[PDB]
Amino acid sequence: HWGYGKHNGPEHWHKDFPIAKGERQSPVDIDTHTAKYDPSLKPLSVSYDQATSLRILNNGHAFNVEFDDSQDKAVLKGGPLDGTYRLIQFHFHWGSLDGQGSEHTVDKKKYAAELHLVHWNTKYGDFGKAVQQPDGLAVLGIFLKVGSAKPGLQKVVDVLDSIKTKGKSADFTNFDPRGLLPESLDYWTYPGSLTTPPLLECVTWIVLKEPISVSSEQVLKFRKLNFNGEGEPEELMVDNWRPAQPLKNRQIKASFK
Numbered sequence: 151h152w153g154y155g156k157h158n159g160p161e162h163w164h165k166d167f168p169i170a171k172g173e174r175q176s177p178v179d180i181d182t183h184t185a186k187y188d189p190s191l192k193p194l195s196v197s198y199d200q201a202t203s204l205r206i207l208n209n210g211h212a213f214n215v216e217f218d219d220s221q222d223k224a225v226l227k228g229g230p231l232d233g234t235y236r237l238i239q240f241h242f243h244w245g246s247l248d249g250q251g252s253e254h255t256v257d258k259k260k261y262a263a264e265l266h267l268v269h270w271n272t273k274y275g276d277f278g279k280a281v282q283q284p285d286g287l288a289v290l291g292i293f294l295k296v297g298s299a300k301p302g303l304q305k306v307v308d309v310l311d312s313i314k315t316k317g318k319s320a321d322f323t324n325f326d327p328r329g330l331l332p333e334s335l336d337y338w339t340y341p342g343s344l345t346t347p348p349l350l351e352c353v354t355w356i357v358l359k360e361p362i363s364v365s366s367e368q369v370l371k372f373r374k375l376n377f378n379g380e381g382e383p384e385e386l387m388v389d390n391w392r393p394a395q396p397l398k399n400r401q402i403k404a405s406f407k
């Protein structure tokens with residue numbers, strides 16, 4: 151099966167998922183000097199006051215916090231989007247060391263980790279239909295750098311122990327994802343894909359310019375998770391990130407100059 155190890159990692163994915171070599175794959179390097187400022191872009195509208203988290207899950211590839219998306223509770227609008235996108239889950243990618251871990255890079259700089267808040271376009275009625283459309287998903291990407299602690303993240307950090315191995319889940323209610331946002335919502339955007347299989351080209355990427363800060367201790371706890379299931383030989387969950395892919399015929403746009 152696919153993974154992030156030497157025998158099943160990203161350069162192998164194309165054998166089972168040939169869209170891996172497609173024309174609008176993610177992530178990409180953001181070259182800040184060739185990004186085009188687009189004054190037509192609207193500000194992002196993040197409406198997460200009525201967010202309802204449900205559960206946190208180790209799926210063997212990351213951990214996901216899941217939200218109730220049966221209603222327009224937590225939604226993303228504005229920016230380069232037309233329409234309303236509902237939050238369904240968030241997850242992270244991170245490294246074995248602080249100098250790597252993000253999926254996107256900025257002028258080839260890697261960050262320690264990357265947060266993805268995944269939303270789907272409610273005109274398609276359910277997530278499974280949305281991933282089959284070119285405008286079906288919008289993923290908000292936020293970089294993490296190591297420095298001070300992020301108080302808003304600690305609640306997540308403290309449950310990881312209970313979902314250490316693949317397939318484990320825990321109740322996770324009343325978590326407010328507003329606690330994970332930077333001060334500024336300035337962004338870059340481009341059309342891209344899921345960065346894990348099935349690698350579908352259905353995502354409008356919105357990558358925030360301002361990183362959030364987390365402490366070494368916090369990121370350290372991420373690295374204690376396991377890719378394996380219980381009773382299996384221990385494989386630490388680290389470096390679950392996909393390299394930058396060719397930009398090909400795409401323009402990255404910026405909401406700021």
Ligand SMILES: NS(=O)(=O)c1nnc(-c2ccccc2Cl)s1
Pocket residue numbers: 239266268289343344345346347348
């Ligand atoms: N890293 S990511 O946000 O582009 C992403 N990639 N794959 C995702 C996915 C794949 C299968 C089912 C559900 C999701 Cl949410 S979400």
Ligand SMILES: [Zn+2]
Pocket residue numbers: 241242243266345
């Ligand atoms: Zn992701």
